[PDB]
Structure formats: structure tokens, C-alpha cells
Structure 1
Amino acid sequence: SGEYPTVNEIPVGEVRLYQIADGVWSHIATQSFDGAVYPSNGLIVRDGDELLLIDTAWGAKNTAALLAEIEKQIGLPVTRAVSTHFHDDRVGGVDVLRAAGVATYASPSTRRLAEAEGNEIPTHSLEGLSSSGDAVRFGPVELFYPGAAHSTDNLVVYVPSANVLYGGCAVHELSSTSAGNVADADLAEWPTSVERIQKHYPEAEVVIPGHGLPGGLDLLQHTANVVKAHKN
């Protein structure tokens, strides 16, 4: 009923959308992993009379449910998707997307890692993102590679028309007390990569983490603080 969705308010097997700004939504779904249940976020950005999707809904059935929710709530076709790193909360569902007519994209680094992991693999490679600080345009967004953080391949996404920064899993929500799933992380570089984001996007108004509640620019500093304390 208008608050940001959580596991407790998403019916089983479902997806919810949340309007962030004009022509910008997040998508929220839940998944089980290793016997625990987690929420995750992605992004939807209006691209004229089409939509750009950022990240899957963490699984094939969740991603089918995401497409249905988009049809119900927005009614414009999803024509392209970008996955922001190789984990299953970002690429799990890419095969569903690909069979629904969506063109799927990721950096070459993400594609290699996904393949090596046994995860679903986006079709198209995003060049121009291999060095930290690199940025490229993709429809209505900018894609930015901040350096290694949550993963070596993590990308962030900026929506310039709305000053929305989608941090993905490199950015944590303000209630977080730990650095989340750090299996593939670079704890030592992560603060430096966050500082690069802070420097590049000083006008961000909304910051969306890969998991949990959006907020403002303070999510960036909080993330650096939690990572440094996990490493300590």
C-alpha cells in the first residue's frame, strides 16, 4: 500500500514494482538461497515507448512473474536488459528474457564469470567498461564501472533524467550490518570503488541498493563503513 516492498508483502512467487521517479521503477522479488530467504532489487527505465530492464528478478519463475507484472502495471514492452554482475540475482532469468524477445547484455567480464559459474549468460557484450571509471551510454541510462567491490565485474547505473543512482550489489541499504554475500568481493578495493561512485555522481537524489530499501547519497558512505568493519 505504498511503502517500499519487502519479503513480508510480496506474495509467494510474485514480483512488486515501486515507482522511484517519472519513468523509473524498481522491481522487488524474493528468493531462497542456502536455506535463507532474501529480497532483491532491479530497475526499469522508460525508453520512449519501450522499457530497459536492469537485472533479472533472481530466477526463471520470478523473472516470468516480473514480465507479467510489467505488462499489468506499465504496459510497454521490455526490449533490452542489462545485468550488472554475474550472480544469479542479476542473471538468473536471462533465458526467460531471451525467449520473451528481450535482448540481454552484460560486460565481457560478467559474461565470462557467469559462464564459469554455470549461471545464465547474457547474449551481448558491453564494451567500453573494462577500466575503473569507465562510462558508456545505454538508452536512457549511463553504465559506470567503479572498480572491484561486491564483485570484480559490478556495474552501477545512473538515470540522468531523474538523478537516480542504481548501485546494485556494490551498494548496501542503510539498515545493513554486514557486507552481505562477500564470496566474490574485494573488501580492500570496495571503499575506493565507492569513492569513485561518490565523485562521479554527486547530484544523485535516490540511491538504490541491490538488496533492500532505497535512500539518498548516505547509502554510499554507509556501504564503505560496513565493508571496512566486515574486513576489520
Structure 2
Amino acid sequence: GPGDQRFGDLVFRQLAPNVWQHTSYLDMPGFGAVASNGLIVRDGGRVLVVDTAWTNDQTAQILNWIKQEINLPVALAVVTHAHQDKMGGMDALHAAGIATYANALSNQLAPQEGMVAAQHSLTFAANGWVEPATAPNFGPLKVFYPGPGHTSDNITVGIDGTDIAFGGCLIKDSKAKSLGNLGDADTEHYAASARAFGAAFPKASMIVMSHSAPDSRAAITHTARMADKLR
């Protein structure tokens, strides 16, 4: 094969014939450089983005990479929760004229989290699945709210026609020593949420997450086990 492509300050790794993982890095004091992962999906004739990079400039570099390597318009972008690593680059999307979507609760939280709100709000049915009327032209993206975990507003996405499911920062890999930043976490409902995500995408084999390489379903089980210790 061919190695993961370096473009600007970013790294792109193709997970499927129409799916790529974009990675951006931010220096955290004494922690070294921290990677944050999102996704890029090619649907027929347009591109779909999941999550921004840490910053606007990094997010602009993503759009440049798409123009160079895919050359299709970015129809929309969905962000998974109101934290810098997922919504830090909203202005870059808006400057490019891209319709952005986020959980309604994420947009509510954006000001207190110091984030720019998305332009459109997603609402989810009682069973967790997004109400289609609020998510037009999402194509293969299946959006699902598993409940409060990493944050109160974290959502997850599965890509129809693939074995991929993106858990975002809700899920950690199968050997993570902790659930990381629990500043805005719901310790009570966390465990139940990770298990809901797994049940929502029962056939997904490649689990993509924010802070490590794609893992198996062992990531879901392992994350839930760690979450049980919080309640």
C-alpha cells in the first residue's frame, strides 16, 4: 500500500475507498502533541465532514486537502460535541460557505464552552436516532445520540455501506488507562451511553475515535468497563 498522507500540519489516513480520517495536533503542556481525529466521506458527488480540527487554520487546511485530493464540494459538516478539538474550527467552515450541523444541546453549550455554534441544530427521537427532518442530505451518515457520557451533548456517527462507526471522544481504545478529560462528563450515565452506541451500530467492526488509531469493538467494551467504575 501507501503511507498516511502528510498535508500541511495534518495527517490523512484512508480507512475505506470513500472514507478518510483527518488528524490535527495541538501542543498540551508536558503532554506532548495531542492528536484529534475526525472523518471525511465522499458521497457520490459531494464531500461530508465529521468534526473540525483544533483550530480554524487547521480546518482550512482540511478543506484545501479535499480540494486537491477529491475535488468535490463539501456539502455539509457535522460536529459531535462542544469542545475545541471537535468545534474549534467552525469559523473556517462558515467562511467557506459550508452548512454545519450539531446537536441542539451542543449549540446551547457553545457559548459557555467558548465555541462557535453550528448553523443548524439536530434533534433526536426518543430512541436516540436523529429526526430526519433536521438532518437533510446526510446520505450515508447515520447520526445517533447515545446519551450523556464524555459530555451531555456527545453524539455518534455511523457510515452506511461500511464497517465504520465513529464514537468520538465518548469511546477510548481497548487499552486506555482512563476516560481522560471528565470535566463535563456525566459519570452516572456514562457506562450506559457507551453500551448504547455499541447496540446502535451492532455490525460495525472498525471503531474510530478522537484520540487514537481505529480499534475493534473491544474499545466499546473496555470503555464501558472503565465507565462502570465511576458510578
TM-score norm. by structure 1 comes to: 0.89
Matches of residues 1-232 of structure 1 in structure 2 within 5 Å? 2=2, 14-33=9-28, 36=31, 37-127=33-123, 129=124, 131=126, 133-136=128-131, 138-229=138-229, 231=230
Give the Å deviation of 1:76: 1.8
**RMSD over aligned Cα atoms:** 2.1
In 1, the alpha carbon distance for the partners of 2:212 and 2:3 equals 12
Quick one: which amino acid aligns to residue 79 of structure 2?
S
Decide whether the 8 Å contact of 2:144 with 2:200 is kept in 1. no
Structure 1, unaligned runs of 5 or more:
none
Give the Å deviation of 1:131: 4.2
For residues 44 and 179 of structure 1, do their structure 2 counterparts lie closer, same or farther at Cα, with a shift above 3 Å needed? same
In 2, the alpha carbon distance for the partners of 1:157 and 1:84 equals 8
In 1, the alpha carbon distance for the partners of 2:207 and 2:61 equals 25
Decide whether the 8 Å contact of 1:136 with 1:143 is kept in 2. no
SS at structure 2 position matched to 1:89 = helix
For residues 87 and 130 of structure 1, do their structure 2 counterparts lie closer, same or farther at Cα, with a shift above 3 Å needed? farther
Decide whether the 8 Å contact of 1:136 with 1:144 is kept in 2. no
For residues 101 and 83 of structure 1, do their structure 2 counterparts lie closer, same or farther at Cα, with a shift above 3 Å needed? same
Decide whether the 8 Å contact of 1:178 with 1:227 is kept in 2. no
Give the Å deviation of 1:61: 1.5
Alignment deviations for residues 86-113 of structure 1 (CA, whole Å, 9 cap, x no partner): 0011111110110012111111100010
Alignment deviations for residues 95-150 of structure 1 (CA, whole Å, 9 cap, x no partner): 011001211111110001012222111111112x2646233452221100000010
Structure 2, unaligned runs of 5 or more:
133-137
SS at structure 2 position matched to 1:98 = helix
In 2, the alpha carbon distance for the partners of 1:224 and 1:4 equals 30
Decide whether the 8 Å contact of 1:42 with 1:54 is kept in 2. yes
TM-score norm. by structure 2 comes to: 0.89
SS at structure 2 position matched to 1:116 = coil
Decide whether the 8 Å contact of 1:17 with 1:26 is kept in 2. yes
For residues 34 and 189 of structure 1, do their structure 2 counterparts lie closer, same or farther at Cα, with a shift above 3 Å needed? farther
In 2, the alpha carbon distance for the partners of 1:38 and 1:132 equals 34
Percent identity, aligned pairs only?
36
In 2, the alpha carbon distance for the partners of 1:89 and 1:132 equals 27
Alignment deviations for residues 57-77 of structure 1 (CA, whole Å, 9 cap, x no partner): 111111111112222222222
In 2, the alpha carbon distance for the partners of 1:174 and 1:158 equals 19
SS at structure 1 position matched to 2:112 = helix
In 1, the alpha carbon distance for the partners of 2:17 and 2:186 equals 35
SS at structure 2 position matched to 1:117 = coil
In 2, the alpha carbon distance for the partners of 1:142 and 1:180 equals 26
Decide whether the 8 Å contact of 2:53 with 2:89 is kept in 1. yes
